[PDB]
Amino acid sequence: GITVLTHSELSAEIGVTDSIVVSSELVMPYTVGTWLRGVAANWSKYSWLSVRYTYIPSCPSSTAGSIHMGFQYDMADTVPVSVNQLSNLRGYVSGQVWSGSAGLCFINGTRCSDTSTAISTTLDVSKLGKKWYPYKTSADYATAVGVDVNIATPLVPARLVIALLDGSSSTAVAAGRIYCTYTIQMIEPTASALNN
Amino acid sequence: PTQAVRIRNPAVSSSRGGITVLTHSELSAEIGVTDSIVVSSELVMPYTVGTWLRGVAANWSKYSWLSVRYTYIPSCPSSTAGSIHMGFQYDMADTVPVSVNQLSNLRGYVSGQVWSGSAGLCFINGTRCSDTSTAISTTLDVSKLGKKWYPYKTSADYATAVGVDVNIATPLVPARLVIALLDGSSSTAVAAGRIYCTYTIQMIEPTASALNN
Amino acid sequence: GGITVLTHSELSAEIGVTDSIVVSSELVMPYTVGTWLRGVAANWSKYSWLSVRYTYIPSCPSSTAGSIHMGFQYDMADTVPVSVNQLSNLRGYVSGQVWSGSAGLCFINGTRCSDTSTAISTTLDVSKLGKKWYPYKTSADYATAVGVDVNIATPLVPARLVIALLDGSSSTAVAAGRIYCTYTIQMIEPTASALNN
Amino acid sequence: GGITVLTHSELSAEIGVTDSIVVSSELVMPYTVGTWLRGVAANWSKYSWLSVRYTYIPSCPSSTAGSIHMGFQYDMADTVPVSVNQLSNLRGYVSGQVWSGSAGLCFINGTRCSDTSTAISTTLDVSKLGKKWYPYKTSADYATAVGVDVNIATPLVPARLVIALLDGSSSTAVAAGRIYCTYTIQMIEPTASALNN
Amino acid sequence: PTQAVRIRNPAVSSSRGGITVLTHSELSAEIGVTDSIVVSSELVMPYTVGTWLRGVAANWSKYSWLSVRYTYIPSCPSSTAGSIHMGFQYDMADTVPVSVNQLSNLRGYVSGQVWSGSAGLCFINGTRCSDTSTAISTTLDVSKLGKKWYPYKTSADYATAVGVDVNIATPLVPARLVIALLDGSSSTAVAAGRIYCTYTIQMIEPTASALNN
Amino acid sequence: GITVLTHSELSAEIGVTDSIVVSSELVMPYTVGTWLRGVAANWSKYSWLSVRYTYIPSCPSSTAGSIHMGFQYDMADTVPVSVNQLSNLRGYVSGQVWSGSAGLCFINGTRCSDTSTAISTTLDVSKLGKKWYPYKTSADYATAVGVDVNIATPLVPARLVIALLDGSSSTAVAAGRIYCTYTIQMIEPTASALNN
Ligand SMILES: [Ca+2]
Ligand SMILES: [Ca+2]
Ligand SMILES: [Ca+2]
Ligand SMILES: [Ca+2]
Ligand SMILES: [Ca+2]
Ligand SMILES: [Ca+2]
Numbered sequence A, F: 001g002i003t004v005l006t007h008s009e010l011s012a013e014i015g016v017t018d019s020i021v022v023s024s025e026l027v028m029p030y031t032v033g034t035w036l037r038g039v040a041a042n043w044s045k046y047s048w049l050s051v052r053y054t055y056i057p058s059c060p061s062s063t064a065g066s067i068h069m070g071f072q073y074d075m076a077d078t079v080p081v082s083v084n085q086l087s088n089l090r091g092y093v094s095g096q097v098w099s100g101s102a103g104l105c106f107i108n109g110t111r112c113s114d115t116s117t118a119i120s121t122t123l124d125v126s127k128l129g130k131k132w133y134p135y136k137t138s139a140d141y142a143t144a145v146g147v148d149v150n151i152a153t154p155l156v157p158a159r160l161v162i163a164l165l166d167g168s169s170s171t172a173v174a175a176g177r178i179y180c181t182y183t184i185q186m187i188e189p190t191a192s193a194l195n196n
Numbered sequence B, E: 001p002t003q004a005v006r007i008r009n010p011a012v013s014s015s016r017g018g019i020t021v022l023t024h025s026e027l028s029a030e031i032g033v034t035d036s037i038v039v040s041s042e043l044v045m046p047y048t049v050g051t052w053l054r055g056v057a058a059n060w061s062k063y064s065w066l067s068v069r070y071t072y073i074p075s076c077p078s079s080t081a082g083s084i085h086m087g088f089q090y091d092m093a094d095t096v097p098v099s100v101n102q103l104s105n106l107r108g109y110v111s112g113q114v115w116s117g118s119a120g121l122c123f124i125n126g127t128r129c130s131d132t133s134t135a136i137s138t139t140l141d142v143s144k145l146g147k148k149w150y151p152y153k154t155s156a157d158y159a160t161a162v163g164v165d166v167n168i169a170t171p172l173v174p175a176r177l178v179i180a181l182l183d184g185s186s187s188t189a190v191a192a193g194r195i196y197c198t199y200t201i202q203m204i205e206p207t208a209s210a211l212n213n
Numbered sequence C, D: 001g002g003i004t005v006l007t008h009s010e011l012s013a014e015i016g017v018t019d020s021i022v023v024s025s026e027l028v029m030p031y032t033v034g035t036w037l038r039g040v041a042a043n044w045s046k047y048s049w050l051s052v053r054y055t056y057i058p059s060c061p062s063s064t065a066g067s068i069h070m071g072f073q074y075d076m077a078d079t080v081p082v083s084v085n086q087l088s089n090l091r092g093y094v095s096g097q098v099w100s101g102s103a104g105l106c107f108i109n110g111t112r113c114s115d116t117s118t119a120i121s122t123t124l125d126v127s128k129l130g131k132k133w134y135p136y137k138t139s140a141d142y143a144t145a146v147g148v149d150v151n152i153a154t155p156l157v158p159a160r161l162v163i164a165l166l167d168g169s170s171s172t173a174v175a176a177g178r179i180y181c182t183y184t185i186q187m188i189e190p191t192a193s194a195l196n197n
Helices: A034-040 A083-088 A101-107 A138-147 B051-058 B118-125 B155-164 C035-041 C102-108 C139-148 D035-041 D102-108 D139-148 E051-058 E118-125 E155-164 F034-040 F083-088 F101-107 F138-147
Strands: A003-016 A022-026 A043-057 A066-072 A090-096 A120-122 A159-165 A173-189 B011-015 B019-033 B038-043 B060-074 B083-089 B107-113 B137-139 B176-182 B190-206 C004-017 C022-027 C044-058 C067-073 C091-097 C121-124 C160-166 C174-190 D004-017 D022-027 D044-058 D067-073 D091-097 D121-124 D160-166 D174-190 E011-015 E019-033 E038-043 E060-074 E083-089 E107-113 E137-139 E176-182 E190-206 F003-016 F022-026 F043-057 F066-072 F090-096 F120-122 F159-165 F173-189
Touching: A003 A034, A003 A043, A003 A066, A003 A159, A034 A173, A043 A066, A043 A101, A066 A083, A066 A120, A066 A173, A083 A090, A083 A159, A083 F003, A083 F034, A090 A120, A090 D174, A090 F043, A090 F101, A101 A173, A173 B107, B019 B038, B019 B051, B019 B060, B019 B083, B019 B176, B051 B060, B051 B190, B051 E051, B060 B083, B060 B118, B083 B137, B083 B190, B107 B137, B107 C044, B107 C102, B118 B190, B176 B190, B190 D091, C004 C022, C004 C035, C004 C044, C004 C067, C004 C160, C035 C174, C044 C067, C044 C102, C067 C121, C091 C121, C102 C174, D004 D022, D004 D035, D004 D044, D004 D067, D004 D160, D035 D174, D044 D067, D044 D102, D067 D121, D091 D121, D102 D174, E019 E038, E019 E051, E019 E060, E019 E083, E019 E176, E051 E060, E051 E190, E060 E083, E060 E118, E083 E137, E083 E190, E107 E137, E118 E190, E176 E190, F003 F034, F003 F043, F003 F066, F003 F159, F034 F173, F043 F066, F043 F101, F066 F083, F066 F120, F066 F173, F083 F090, F083 F159, F090 F120, F101 F173
Parallel strands: none
Antiparallel strands: A003 A173, A003 C004, A022 A159, A043 A120, A043 A173, A066 A090, A066 A159, B011 B019, B011 E011, B019 B190, B038 B176, B060 B137, B060 B190, B083 B107, B083 B176, C004 C174, C022 C160, C044 C121, C044 C174, C067 C091, C067 C160, D004 D174, D004 F003, D022 D160, D044 D121, D044 D174, D067 D091, D067 D160, E011 E019, E019 E190, E038 E176, E060 E137, E060 E190, E083 E107, E083 E176, F003 F173, F022 F159, F043 F120, F043 F173, F066 F090, F066 F159
16 A cells, blocks of 8 residues: 655755854655655655765866765754764765766666766665654754654654865855665655644 | 434443444434535544543543444435535644535445435444435444544544644644534535444553543 | 556545536546646656546435436547437447445445445446557646647546436536546656646 | 674662662663663664563672562553562562672673572563564653653554562662663664654 | 572463353462461452452453462561461451461461472473472462352452442452461561462453453 | 774874974874774773874865875884985885875865875785784883883884975965875773773
8 A cells, every 4th residue: 555656856055165064854754855746745655765965076177175964863963963973873974075976877777887976875765763654844853853853763763964164255156966876665645734 | 314323332242352342323413404514524533523422431541443434314304405425534733624625535435315325224223224325424434443443532642742743742642523514505514414423442451441541 | 667657546526417418527647647647747747548547426315316427538529428329329328327436435435335226327348549658737727728629638638427417306506426537557757746737 | 785784781879778669660662671772773764673672680689678570561551560578479570689780790791691599680572562673752741741641652662571579678768789781682673862752 | 499489471261152261370468477476358349369360351241260379479587486377257347367277267368488389380380280288379269159140340440449348348349368477576577578368260241441340 | 802993183284394204103092083082091902903004184286295104013123214215115116295185085085096096005004013002101111111122012013104305385275185085993991091
């Protein structure tokens, strides 16, 4: 009784700066990207079978800056604040904001060989909290976490933390984008308008 | 013709390993049809499924649904105008359906004329079932719920928690049965029928009945 | 591979028995089959029906006189039947009592079926369709396109479902039942929803 | 692969016999099992108990009257037993003489065991737990979270160990023994310690 | 040496015919010895026998004792002065014994040194029993009680009735365990031990747990 | 009786300059990186099963500079002072401070093919002094070596010497970072607070 799809879409745009900057995204349908957010909402619950966040440049060999990515699973865990701390999470990965063009291969999902350079990490769907998570809206989750963070562990598998520094200027510079490549199992439909 | 409703004695067995297994049927809820749509919801958690189950299961810290079946049985005549609707929701936080339509989308949606579903009877009687095509009854998927083992929760304590934030519910209860009735003929409720739940639950980790919250 | 197969059964349309041979008709394409399917399918540029089944289901009393009729037209050019007489010739013609058909329920909840003779339900025969892969179309746009010339539609929609309601008992609508649609579809070539027309 | 399995046995908690049925209770999670385990495990975001065993071990004289009781609760919602009467119903209930249990030593030093009937020790049955992989939690944070509502805890900790001490001989504490914990854990998804809450 | 107390999971089985059979052991009561004699009594009725049984059996209108065994287990040292005494009474109206003597007359009288009875352990553990000669434990005769089937009664409702007139009890409860402790060394209670009850009860005619009085 | 883990973390940040600059790090848990330093301390001794130092850029194709790395094992051996000398140690390896983005693959430990370019070297755990080394704190080792260097041979397997030159400016420039990827066997636990 499952309907499963596989797809890649844009997840978020990246900017480099003079000082370090740590941000994070949840690894739940609603936030991964617009497309999925939309389709996934038509089913009550889901399960990740494969999730991959791939960084891809848009700047030039000339622009300085480095990106960093990792996964966290507690949610209550205080989000990293130093490249070092971040380098410790599962699936760490770092590179120059202009490197990673090799990861492209993952998004059009073809025949890949030279992926050494790829600035892309993958979620370990196997060691996740549970298998079936409820589809949640950023807004509703927000509220729950407003009460207490730990209320989130049963709503989301994990989150992707991102750090960006070693910038040329102390004022945002288009560096690249992060796209997500997933394979999700969706179950127990519902009118999209009812899902929270 | 019709038939007579006769419920069978509960079955309890101690499957060495800690598990005590109860299989039984109880009248879960009474139904009424009006001319305007009306949606109600029932938590598919031991405490609210049934009066007896409520008491029995209390003596066990946790449980696991093995087979849950809500069957609709009529109690009005073929002349009674009205339709019933049932479905399942899993994120207690999701909004409760409002149209016979939205409800038509949920897992195990089932619909029929208030005066039908009489075939489903065999589910409650525990007799050998015949043509269940006309039967109005749905079942929980079980194999796709958050956790396998859920904690016996009191309707009260549940509400208290769900009061802090509804999302705290997802880790306490598997799902809920959504029910809707419309296409009725009176602005004032008319005897529709009732929904009986036929379950089989595994109960573990014993605790004093009054220690359990 | 590339295909996102999904099989679901949702409410397609509510029905009202009357006494003036009334003919309606819905296109057999995503945007129109049902609300839910419309929602999801929009996220894909094209699709193909693997199995479509429109089933009628009562909600009235054992009396409430009335009959419901269903048929399929394939060339959007042909004129929608005006009389049940013509509707009866159509491919996959099915007629029945407004309160009968409770047996078809087995199609909706997916369970195994028993006796489906009393059931009021018909299906689209995917084999004799023009294209295999149709473009997802918003009825709103379809409309405009048909305004130019109906034939422009032939290549946009597999078929049309013609419904007929008569032999009732009231000058004004009387609630009779609904038509649920149980389909199996293959969706392809994703697109952001708002872009699909 | 990804898992960092570690099996160790360290002191979990020191015990004092008295004469006022005293009930304590520790969570069965890393941060609380013991000091050492707390230290290491923090470096990993989650974990799973493969085997947990709390064993009691004497340090007093062959007399020093006193009894020790151990049980496991699974829904942090349930009220901690107040009387040994309720503690005795619990899953994996174990009672014993404050100076008895010297036989359990075999569990701590890992050697092969002989007669474990005199030994005072119980184990968590990993099979009937809610999740498989729990989040590592600092009791300090757990606390706060439980302050909102205890149920928020259910998904953060496998179980709780309820201990009871009574039938002693002094109005004031008397040294009786310790409870060592022998566990086998699978640690996953590393994180810098200071970030784990 | 001693041993470790370990109680076994309850056993429940549905013996077609309406009977549900539960066999289990629970700590029934805690004991304290003083220098002056002190007699206490415990009703051998499901509600008071044990905390768990209390909850479980509530879901059944009637029951029947099949095997009731009160076993005394020590928790003090061989240096503790004191003796325990247990017996049975059947007419709740009869006066409660006052001398270690009168008590020596009742059915299944048993006596020992507060620090003994350790052998009786095997009764609670559910292990194969060895030398039970030294064991302090007695059993209800069962085959000679007023009725076979008794009504589940609430400690409260029982008392209310016994309040009108004690004799109204004979038709509500089978018997009561009489307990006495003396030969102690302090004018202030010292940890003696505790009495565990090991039963096997037949429960019939189900009822909502909260409907039962 | 061993507990063994495998992980990658940040070991140290790199800066390029107008003149040559030679620095060195010990290949002992405590110094490899924070994470390991922390966990490893809970065990009295350990053994390397695999140690790899990988350099990864963070600058731009435009920034000039070259990095150099090698291993030394005596400890008393006078640390190199010329690119040449360094080029002689085991596992030498050099490249442009902006090259090496291909080594990334080693850190997320995936499917690597195009690692020719990788600025990354590996320790020969096999020809090491002994197998089981004692966990040591930088501070305690420091003291011992204060007496005599040779006292170190029984405390540490080896050290990674690093040289950086051919810089654009005569004043530090963020070039990249060196991460360590290890697989260690830890034995004979101890309260972390006692290990020196
Ligand atoms: Ca939801
Ligand atoms: Ca509970
Ligand atoms: Ca389109
Ligand atoms: Ca944490
Ligand atoms: Ca009663
Ligand atoms: Ca050391």
